[PDB]
Design a protein around this nucleic acid. Sequence first.
DNA 1: ATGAATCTATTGGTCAAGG
DNA 2: CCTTGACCAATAGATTCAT
Length: 85
Amino acid sequence: SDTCEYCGKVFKNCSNLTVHRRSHTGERPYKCELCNYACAQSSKLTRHMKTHGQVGKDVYKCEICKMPFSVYSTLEKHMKKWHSD
DNA sequence: ATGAATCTATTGGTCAAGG
DNA sequence: CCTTGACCAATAGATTCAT
Ligand SMILES: [Mg+2]
Ligand SMILES: [Mg+2]
Ligand SMILES: [Zn+2]
Ligand SMILES: [Zn+2]
Ligand SMILES: [Zn+2]
Ligand SMILES: [Zn+2]
């Protein structure tokens, strides 16, 4: 069958349906080790990891919580979000 | 001064090929 | 099957643009 039990969307295989269904169940088994990010698809965690460090970018660490960032403006957004005081 | 438009960086949903 | 990753829309914040 490979059809979503929640919205009826049809798929060509079981695994794409499994990933899709997590958007109805809220399940997010893939959790980043370097921040609170969590996701339903393993390659999504891989892509998110680029924001903590990537070839061709430096690493800017948060002076307060030590979290690493490959993009400095993202570290600035992190400062505003988590360490606003 | 204010809001619309438009950038960046990043993420969510989708789809399909590699292992 | 699980893994992988390209692609396109959406999102949040920053900035520019128009008036
Ligand atoms: Mg499919
Ligand atoms: Mg591929
Ligand atoms: Zn569904
Ligand atoms: Zn199936
Ligand atoms: Zn993370
Ligand atoms: Zn921090």
